[PDB]
Amino acid sequence: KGKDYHVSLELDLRGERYENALSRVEKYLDDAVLAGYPRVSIIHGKGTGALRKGVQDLLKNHRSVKSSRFGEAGEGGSGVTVVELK
């Protein structure tokens, strides 16, 4: 039984660096292993570059994620990275 630890459905990493973002993102993605859920959305605001490429590549290589897709009209256009869980 998985009951002693809780999981959420949204990620917030405003202004984080590449490696800190990696550390928090991997934990966030692996949290739902025992409590799966449909998908999640990622928002930062704005930044000084394009680490979305690395984030998307890691998500597509993630073991417990079936796939990753993008957002509809209610999800800030198709620019928002959406992680489709199993």
């Binding site: 993008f70 509809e72 009209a73 256009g77 198709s78 620019g79």
Partner: protein, 114 residues
């Protein structure tokens, strides 16, 4: 047919998309009305986003990879279609904000509330 130029009009009612060659020769085009939006929905960013990937699909089969985009007029479709292009797998090398800005031009039409 490897390089081209994608032109998109960003109006307040519609968003056209057209691609051309460096010699200014068209290949294919699309639009919200082309896809099936008839009303004010054509002005939504979603309609322009759809327009983007249909233009991309009409582009690939003729074998063009690299693009650079010219945007005309102000509208909600400014941000949608440009990133829809790279969402469609293509590669857009530059963004050009070319709009007709006359120095004085012609006297504009009357006001909307008289």
């Amino acid at each position: 047919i490897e390089s081209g130029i994608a032109h998109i009009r960003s109006t307040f009612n519609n968003t056209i998309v057209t691609i051309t060659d460096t010699h200014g020769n068209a290949i294919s085009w699309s639009s919200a009305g082309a896809l099936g939006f008839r009303g004010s929905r054509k002005s939504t960013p979603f309609a322009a986003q759809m327009a983007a990937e249909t233009a991309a699909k009409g582009s690939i089969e003729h074998g063009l990879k690299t693009l650079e985009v010219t945007v005309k007029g102000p509208g909600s479709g400014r941000e949608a279609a440009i990133r829809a292009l790279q969402a469609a797998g293509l590669e857009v090398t530059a963004i050009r904000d070319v709009t007709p800005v006359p120095h004085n031009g012609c006297r504009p039409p009357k006001r909307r509330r008289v």
